[PDB]
Amino acid sequence: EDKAAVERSKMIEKQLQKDKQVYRRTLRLLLLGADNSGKSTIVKQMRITSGIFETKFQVDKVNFHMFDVGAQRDERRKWIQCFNDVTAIIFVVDSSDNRLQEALNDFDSIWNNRWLRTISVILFLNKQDLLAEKVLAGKSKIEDYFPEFARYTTPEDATPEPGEDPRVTRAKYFIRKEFVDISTASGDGRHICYPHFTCAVDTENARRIFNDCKDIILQMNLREYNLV
Amino acid sequence: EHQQYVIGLFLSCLYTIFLFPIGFVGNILILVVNISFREKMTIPDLYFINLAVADLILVADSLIEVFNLHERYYDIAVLCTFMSLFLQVNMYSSVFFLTWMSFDRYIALARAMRCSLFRTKHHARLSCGLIWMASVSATLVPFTAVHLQHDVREVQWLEVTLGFIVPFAIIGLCYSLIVRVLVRAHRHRRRQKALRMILAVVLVFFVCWLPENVFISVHLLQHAHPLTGHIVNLAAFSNSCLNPLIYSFLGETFRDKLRLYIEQK
Amino acid sequence: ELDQLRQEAEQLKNQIRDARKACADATLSQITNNIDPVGRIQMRTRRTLRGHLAKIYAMHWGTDSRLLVSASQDGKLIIWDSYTTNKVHAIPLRSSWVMTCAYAPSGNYVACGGLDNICSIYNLKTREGNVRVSRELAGHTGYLSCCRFLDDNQIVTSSGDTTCALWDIETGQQTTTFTGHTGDVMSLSLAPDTRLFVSGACDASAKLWDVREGMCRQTFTGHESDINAICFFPNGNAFATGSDDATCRLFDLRADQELMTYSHDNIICGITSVSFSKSGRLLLAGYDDFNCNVWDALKADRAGVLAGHDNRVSCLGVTDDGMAVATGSWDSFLKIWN
Amino acid sequence: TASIAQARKLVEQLKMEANIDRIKVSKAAADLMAYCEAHAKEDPLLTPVPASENPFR
Amino acid sequence: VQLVESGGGLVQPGGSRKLSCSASGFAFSSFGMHWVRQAPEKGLEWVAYISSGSGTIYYADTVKGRFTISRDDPKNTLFLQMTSLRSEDTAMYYCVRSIYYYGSSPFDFWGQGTTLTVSSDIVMTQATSSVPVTPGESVSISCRSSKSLLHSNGNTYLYWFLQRPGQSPQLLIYRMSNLASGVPDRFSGSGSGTAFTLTISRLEAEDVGVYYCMQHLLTFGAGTKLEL
């Protein structure tokens, strides 16, 4: 009789609700970045021909699903439509590089995408230590790739990390600005960029992701409640 | 002495000119805009809809307040008895919905990630129903209790307690915590708009509801000053007049919904 | 050598284009001018199948025209009983990022795939009672964009990589592989005879393949932008396409060229899905704007509008019976129109 | 070597696409129109069937 | 797929017993469970039903309240507690599997069965209790119903079972036309909605047994024997 079918449908609905409870409590993150960057080691650092690699990690009793895209074709115009309405995008770049212009183009394309226009980007300026010893080396003159650096000074609002050279801080904040000026140009308050300087081994990477996701969810609810 | 009456008439003219259209038009506009996207409603939209219903009814009754139309309905005992309780439930619903919106904003903004298991559209509608039931109880139960036992001292003490003191305390606590969260977040990582809007809604609530409740308290500890009573009633209705402004189209999200509604409908 | 060979290719392309010019003695509008317009087509949501948690990224009717599978990005295939809206199954996918799903013509199996690059086959009629992964067809190097059953043993799939492949489910091997595109292959449509199938790609070209021989027979290039949807006209001699350029085109296999193009300059949203009605007189299409337009296949004008979704319409399908239409959306609801 | 081989395969494909015969667009449109008119009565969406025939409502 | 029952034996009407069954090789949780008793030298009788998830329970009128059916999905066990026995209860009890959705085949599998020894419904009538027959020739089993079984939804709820001697009943046809899984093409079903037919075209040596008709608008027929 069909009444048994309706009972089966209601049981399936109960299971779907039990799955929805888990779905809403979890924050999805898309991990992007150039190959030279250390995203592959960042995922392996999590202490908790296939495509999507799924990494599960938890901070302060809130779950995170970080998706590394793995094997795909070079251009992401289409499949990134699926990753709409993720909590955030963790774009990872190698600051020690020159691949920096390619990464800037890649971030420009991600930021200005018509579907990711409400997705905040937790920008990771990875490999700050390699950048530090590359700046201290002196031979890798960043100016010849970026002539603007010849006439740039660290801003008054910047605070240096304890025990850092002026030149390394200048260069790293110049790269930070080179990303931030892309972020500011087209984002009409719908999504935000959160730069960070990181080494892949830092135990603070997950903490930073947690704090940024906290801020992103705060902003999302603030806009939902009509406070902005 | 005639100026004492002309001043009340002048305040009523100002109110009907400015505050009343804001209240009525904004409330009806919010109601239609959201009920036209009923399927797109977020949790805050339920509370906005119900607060809009309550404020619309209150601002409509403010037209009875204006021109002192007690002399056209007070003579009918049963009609007046029902309509006074209707006003009481409506204002109770407005104050309780403001308190609940403050608390739920605290939940959504301070405990945003952890408490996702508590904030649900079904929970939003259930809380709407519960708030309406609580207002209806807080009106009828004291009224029927007074009618059985024998405006009364204890009943109006309940009115002042559940109308200003407890609601204001909860609102202030929740919005202070929200302000702490917002200031910390802005410090570390246009958000000044949210801070100003919060401090504006809290102050509007305070300024509008403190006068009537203080007048009630004075007459509770001590028709003697009908003019002052008129001003405080006008302020109580000004709360509902200013609610649609500060809450809905002073912020960007409802303005986007409104633009969608007008351009598509 | 390279320049000479490319010039030879250009010469053959010019020959093909000249042949198409010669065959273009008239346009479909001239031929169909005498026919009676369908008028105002109006459809109402008879059913609203809710229960999915996330964007409904695909759907497919069963041959019985009652059961329809539906894939969601939350990682669920729900087989719905459209007549009663009962959920017959709720298959938990291993990869949450599912971009396509298929219903076997016999109803024994459903398939699905996506960014995992693996097309999982599910058996709906095992003695155990539950639904289990019959096969995991791996071998693509890009996301699985579409998949369609030829029979219970042969399934043809398109990939985010340049390739499109035909699989044997008994062994899990690729019976044949199709090459010729350059961008991502975005959709498949299977001819009624099942001997031919046509696929659109990000290179804005639609190619007709033969499953038995494993080669491209002819190519169509009437789109300025990438193709997101494709569908065969019921007769099997023509097929429609939808592109990001927000206009549909109708191509004929035997004429080897475009016959008609559907557009409305105020429409600037791209097209996500396409489907003919049983008679072929109607050409339904979904748009990035949250509604579907029912074009008259013979007189290119908007016969009606299906505006009932709160977000992008992602999938669209007319029952093999033709009684009803089903549309999914990113709002996580499927609505049956009729 | 690899590039020229790719070009030769493309040239072979173009030669095959040129070899296939074609028919006048008028005839193709005629077949589409004829099929539509033959099967119009069998399309419940084209002509709204009565509520009794419709199994949804 | 196995359903093995436990219990049975001697009981006096002043005693009580619990029937039990263990499910092996299939998702017991998803299946609704039926208890059907085979009284000695008699046809089948439906005893009790418990739906998937335990959300619905039914009992026969003779047993309503006299016995209680229980179920533990985690242990894949079905229980039938027998509070107050009487002489009518002596029978072999089969645990019967059933699942309900569009296109499903309820009563597809029957347990081995255990025998208990002890000191309005749609009446189903079959044409005849027995028919001498020889293998190879066609034959038709027929039955009639107290009322038409053709439900408004558009399908007829009639089932045909074949209880081979010394074996549990096998489902031949469900819903008056659909052959069950593994049933050879020899069998076929038809009916007018109130009178029904079961035809075996080329009777094999293994087709010997009693044929039971059942309706599921539960009542079984008196059973038709094919005396080979």
Q: Identify the closest residue of chain C to D28 by CA–CA distance.
A: C255
d(CA E70, CA E166): 28
Q: Could you give the 3-state DSSP secondary structure of residue A16?
A: helix
Cα separation, C109 vs C72, whole angstroms: 18
Helix (H, G, I), strand (E, B) or coil at B4: helix
Alpha carbons C113 and C142: distance in angstroms, whole number: 11
Nearest Cβ partner for A52 among C89, C95, C139: C95
Q: How far apart are CA C258 and CA D15, in angstroms?
A: 20
DSSP per-residue string spanning C228-252: EEEEE-TTSSEEEEEETTS-EEEEE
Residue C191 in contact with residue C232, Cβ under 8 Å?
A: yes
Evaluated on CA atoms C137, C141, C147, C149, the torsion sign reads negative
Take residue C299 and report the two structure tokens written for it. 């007189």
Closest CA to C100 of C117, C85, C80: C117
Q: In what order do the strands lie in the sheet with C45-50?
A: C45-50, C333-337, C325-329, C313-318
Task: Assign E140 to helix, strand or coil.
Answer: strand
As beta bridge partners, residue E36 has E46, E94
Contacts 24+ apart (CB under 8 A), C195-198: C196/C236, C196/C253, C197/C148, C197/C156, C198/C230, C198/C232, C198/C239
Distance between C194 CA and the closest CA of chain E, angstroms: 26
Q: And the tokens for A212?
A: 């940024």
Token pair 């499953």: residue: C211
Q: What are phi and psi of C297, to 5 degrees?
A: -60, -30
Q: How far apart are CA A75 and CA C184, in angstroms?
A: 9
| Token representation of residue A199 | 């080494």
- Taking the Cβ of residue A77 and every Cβ of chain C, the question of whether any pair is shorter than 8 Å is answered with yes
In whole angstroms, what is the distance from residue C229 CA to residue C236 CA?
16
For residue C52, the enclosing domain spans 1-337
Q: Residue B82's Cα: distance from chain center in Å?
A: 20
Helix (H, G, I), strand (E, B) or coil at C51: coil
Name D24's Cβ contacts closer than 8 Å, sequence gap at least 6: C23, C25, C26, C255
- CATH number attached to the domain at A26-224: 3.40.50.300
Cβ(C317)–Cβ(C61) under 8 Å?
yes
Of E1, E27, E181, the CB nearest to C130: E27
Tell me the chain A residues in contact with residue B253 when contact means C-beta distances shorter than 8 Å: 223-226, 228
Contact across the interface for A24 and B116, Cβ inside 8 Å? yes
The residues pairing with E94 across neighbouring beta strands, listed in sequence order, are: E36
Q: Is there a contact between D17 and C9 if contact means CB atoms under 8 Å apart?
A: no
Cα separation, C138 vs C146, in Å, equals 14
How big is the CA angle at B261 (ends B260 and B264), to the nearest 5 degrees? Answer: 75
Residue D25: its chain C contacts at CB < 8 A?
A: 23-28, 252, 255, 257, 259
Residue B257's closest CA among B6, B29, B93, B17?
B29
DSSP state of A95: T
Neighbours of C22 (CB within 10 A): 11
Helix extents (H) in chain A = 2-25, 39-45, 99-111, 128-137, 166-186, 204-224
Q: Find the helix or strand (DSSP H, E) in which C101 lies.
A: strand C98-103
If you count them, how many residues does chain D have? 57
The CATH number of the domain holding residue B164 is 1.20.1070.10
- Sorted by sequence, the CB contacts under 8 Å of residue E42 that are 6+ apart come out as E91
Range of the domain at B98: 2-264
- Which pair of structure tokens corresponds to residue A65? 């699903």
Alpha-carbon Rg of chain D, whole angstroms? 23
Q: How many angstroms separate the CA atoms of A134 and A132, rounded?
A: 5
- Owner of token pair 């598509």: B264
- Given a contact as 3+ CB pairs under 8 Å, which chains touch D? C
Q: How far apart are CA C225 and CA B253, in angstroms?
A: 34
**Closest Cα in chain C, distance from residue E28 (Å):** 8
Rounded distance, CA B245 to CA A3, Å? Answer: 51
Contacts of A213 (CB under 8 A, 6+ apart): A27, A29, A64, A87, A88, A122, B113
Instruction: Show the tokens assigned to E74.
Output: 């985690």
8-state DSSP, C258: E
Integer Cα distance of C246 and C274 in angstroms: 12
Which sign does the torsion angle of CA B99, B105, B107, B110 carry? Answer: negative
Asked if residues C156 and C188 have their Cβ atoms less than 8 Å apart, the reply is yes
Mapped onto helix, strand or coil, the DSSP state of residue A14 is helix
Residue E142 near residue E127, CB atoms below 8 Å: yes
Distances in Å between the Cα of E105 and the Cα atoms of E101, E172, E180, E222 are: 9, 10, 7, 22
Q: Enumerate the residues of chain C whose CB falls inside 8 A of the CB of residue A12.
A: 51, 78, 87, 89-90
C285: contact with A, CB 8 A cutoff: no
B102: left (phi over 0), alpha (psi -120 to 50) or beta: alpha
Q: Angle CA(B111)–CA(B112)–CA(B115) in degrees, nearest 5?
A: 65
List chains adjacent to chain C, taking adjacency as at least 3 C-beta pairs closer than 8 Å: A, B, D, E
The CB density around residue E49, as the number of other CB atoms within 10 Å, is 20
Q: Under DSSP, is residue A92 helix (H, G, I), strand (E, B) or coil? A: strand
| CB-based contacts of C56, cutoff 8 Å, min separation 6 | C70, C71, C72, C314, C315, C328, C329, C330, C332, C333, C334
Secondary structure class of C28 (helix, strand, coil): helix
- Find residues 9-28 of chain A whose CB sits inside 8 Å of chain E: 10-11
Query: Exposure of C125 by Cβ count < 10 A (0-12 exposed, 13-18 middle, 19+ buried)?
Result: middle
Dihedral (CA of B122, B175, B40, B21) sign: positive
Yes or no: say if C172 and C135 are a contact pair by the CB < 8 Å rule: yes
E179: β partners: E173
**Which of chain C's residues have a Cβ under 8 Å away from the Cβ of E101?**
81, 86, 88-89
Q: How far apart are CA C171 and CA C139, in angstroms?
A: 13
Report the CATH number that the domain containing residue C237 is assigned in CATH: 2.130.10.10
3 state SS of D2:
helix
The pair of structure tokens assigned to E155 is 């399908």
- Contact status of E53 with chain A (Cβ, < 8 Å): yes
What is the secondary structure of C104-150 as a DSSP string? -TTSSEEEEEETTSEEEEEES--TTSS-EEEEEEE--SS-EEEEEES
Domain count, chain B: 1
Q: Which alpha helices (H) appear in B110-191, and where do they start and end?
A: 121-149, 153-160, 166-188
| Second CATH level (architecture) for the domain E124-226 | Sandwich (2.60)
Do C243 and C226 meet the contact criterion of CB atoms below 8 Å apart?
A: yes
Resolution, given in Å to one decimal, reads 3.2
Q: E210: helix, coil or strand? A: strand
What is the residue-wise DSSP string for C284-304? EEEESSSSEEEEESSS-SEEE
Say whether E56 and A7 touch across the interface (CB within 8 A): yes
Q: How many residues does chain C have?
A: 338
CA distance E6 to E29: 19
Location of structure tokens 């719905």: C80
Per the CB < 8 A criterion, the answer to whether D40 and C281 are in contact is yes
Sign, CA torsion D23/D24/D25/D26? negative
| Backbone φ, ψ for residue B171 (5° rounding) | -60, -45
Q: At C193, give phi and psi (nearest 5°).
A: -70, -15
For A52, A76, A116, the CA distances from A109, given in Å and listed in that order, are 21, 10, 10
Q: Which chain C residues are within 8 Å of D36, Cβ to Cβ?
A: 279-281, 297-298
- State which CATH number among 3.30.2420.10, 3.65.10.10, 1.10.10.1100, 2.60.40.10 fits the domain covering E2-118: 2.60.40.10
**Rounded to whole angstroms, how far apart are CA atoms A93 and A131?**
12
Edge to edge, what strands does the sheet with C185-190 contain?
A: C185-190, C196-201, C206-210, C215-220
Q: What are the residue ranges of CATH 2.60.40.10 in chain E?
A: 2-118, 124-226
Report helix, strand or coil for C46: strand
- Tell me the two tokens of residue C257: 């060229």
Does the beta-carbon distance from A50 to C118 stay under 8 Å? Answer: yes
List the single best residue of E100, E102, E156 to mutate versus A (max A Cβ within 10 A): E100
**CA-based end-to-end distance of chain D:** 65
Q: Which domains does chain D have, with CATH numbers?
A: 4-56 (4.10.260.10)
Q: Which residue of E has its CA nearest to A11?
A: E53
DSSP labels for C142-188?
S-EEEEEESSSSEEEEEESSS-EEEEETTTTEEEEEE---SS-EEEE
